[PDB]
Motif scaffolding. Structure first.
Motif, mmCIF file in Angstrom:
data_model
loop_
_atom_site.group_PDB
_atom_site.id
_atom_site.type_symbol
_atom_site.label_atom_id
_atom_site.label_comp_id
_atom_site.label_asym_id
_atom_site.label_seq_id
_atom_site.Cartn_x
_atom_site.Cartn_y
_atom_site.Cartn_z
ATOM 1 N N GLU A 174 -2.556 -1.470 -2.550
ATOM 2 C CA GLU A 174 -4.267 -0.388 -2.699
ATOM 3 C C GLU A 174 -4.396 -0.356 -3.755
ATOM 4 O O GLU A 174 -3.687 -0.045 -4.233
ATOM 5 N N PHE B 21 -7.782 -0.435 0.677
ATOM 6 C CA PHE B 21 -6.683 -0.802 1.678
ATOM 7 C C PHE B 21 -6.848 -2.285 0.692
ATOM 8 O O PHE B 21 -8.146 -3.066 1.053
ATOM 9 N N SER C 141 0.735 -0.927 -0.365
ATOM 10 C CA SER C 141 0.085 -0.168 -0.086
ATOM 11 C C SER C 141 0.969 1.189 -0.006
ATOM 12 O O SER C 141 1.636 1.079 0.885
ATOM 13 N N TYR D 230 -0.293 -1.784 4.599
ATOM 14 C CA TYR D 230 -1.266 -3.538 3.400
ATOM 15 C C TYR D 230 -0.185 -3.798 2.087
ATOM 16 O O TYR D 230 0.539 -3.482 1.844
ATOM 17 N N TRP E 102 5.021 0.981 -5.570
ATOM 18 C CA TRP E 102 4.030 1.537 -4.368
ATOM 19 C C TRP E 102 4.925 2.889 -4.367
ATOM 20 O O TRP E 102 6.310 3.002 -4.037
#
Ligand SMILES: NS(=O)(=O)c1ccc2o/c(=N/O)[nH]c2c1
Ligand SMILES: [Zn+2]
Length: 257
Positions: free
Chosen positions: A114, A143, A102, A111, A241
């Motif tokens: 996402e 999430f 995430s 997480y 990410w």
């Protein structure tokens, strides 16, 4: 070109995109005890009954499902939002391991992934004009944790074999993004940025408190995608990410107490 590797990753982006060091960059960590409950916020209005998915695409950084945004078919309104925002696309960000992936974090919790449903404000006519506005985009962030499978995600998971490498795309009609939502629309909201170049500070972020659960088999199929294009050395599309950025002069608001 920018990416998520050692020499082209998030710590390098400011060189081509100086706004990377800007005043309202995303993602952020959501400190759940610092977020303030705002009772004047409104319920989110998620109107996806008429959505028209068009095609799914490996863009070299994620995979995207795009929709028909030439009409008000799938719109987001309400919440902190003024006006109607049209769903353009969704994509995900995910990790190499379940404990990361995430972009937003909750009390520093990462997480596994996402989901970002990307909406632009119709008052600006097209998405290219919206991104030049402080309130041009609304992104709904959801999430993903690893647990039971998410039935609504399986149609997406099953087509990734056909878009393994950069620039591959495929038909992807009749997909219903309502199948990716959690039960609760409680959220946090703050003003922020795109989390990929150009990192434009045009986003009202709406992050749902409640994760959706996906299965390990579903997330493992994300991790078989490739950053590279066909005929290139294989590089798995993992850890796409951006990490949390400084909140600076911003207050995260909560629709729930
Ligand atoms: N990852 S995000 O903040 O939802 C997002 C959404 C739409 C975008 O369009 C972009 N220009 O190529 N970057 C971007 C990031
Ligand atoms: Zn995103």
């Amino acid at each position: 070109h920018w990416g998520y590797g050692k020499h082209n990753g998030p710590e390098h982006w400011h060189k081509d995109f100086p706004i990377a060091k800007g005043e309202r960059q995303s993602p952020v960590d959501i400190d759940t005890h610092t977020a303030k409950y705002d009772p004047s916020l409104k319920p989110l209005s998620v109107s996806y009954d008429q959505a028209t998915s068009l095609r799914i695409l490996n863009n070299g950084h994620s995979f995207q499902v795009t929709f028909d945004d030439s009409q008000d078919k799938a719109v987001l309104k309400g919440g902190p939002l003024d006006g109607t925002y049209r769903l353009l696309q969704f994509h995900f960000h995910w990790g190499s391991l379940d404990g990361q992936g995430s972009e937003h974090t909750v009390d520093k919790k990462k997480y596994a992934a996402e989901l970002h449903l990307v909406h632009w404000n119709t008052k600006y006519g097209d998405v290219g004009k919206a991104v030049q506005q402080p309130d041009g985009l609304a992104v709904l962030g959801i999430f993903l944790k690893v647990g039971s499978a998410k039935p609504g995600l399986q149609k997406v998971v099953d087509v990734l074999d056909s878009i393994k490498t950069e620039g591959k795309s495929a038909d992807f009609t009749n997909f219903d993004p309502r199948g990716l939502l959690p039960e609760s629309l409680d959220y946090w909201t703050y003003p922020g940025s795109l989390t990929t170049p150009p990192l434009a500070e045009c986003v009202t972020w709406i992050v749902l408190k409640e994760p959706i659960s996906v299965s390990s088999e579903q997330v493992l199929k994300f991790r078989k995608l490739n950053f590279n294009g066909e005929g290139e050395p294989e590089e798995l599309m993992v850890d796409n990410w951006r990490p949390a950025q400084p909140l600076k002069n911003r207050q995260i608001k909560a629709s729930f107490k």
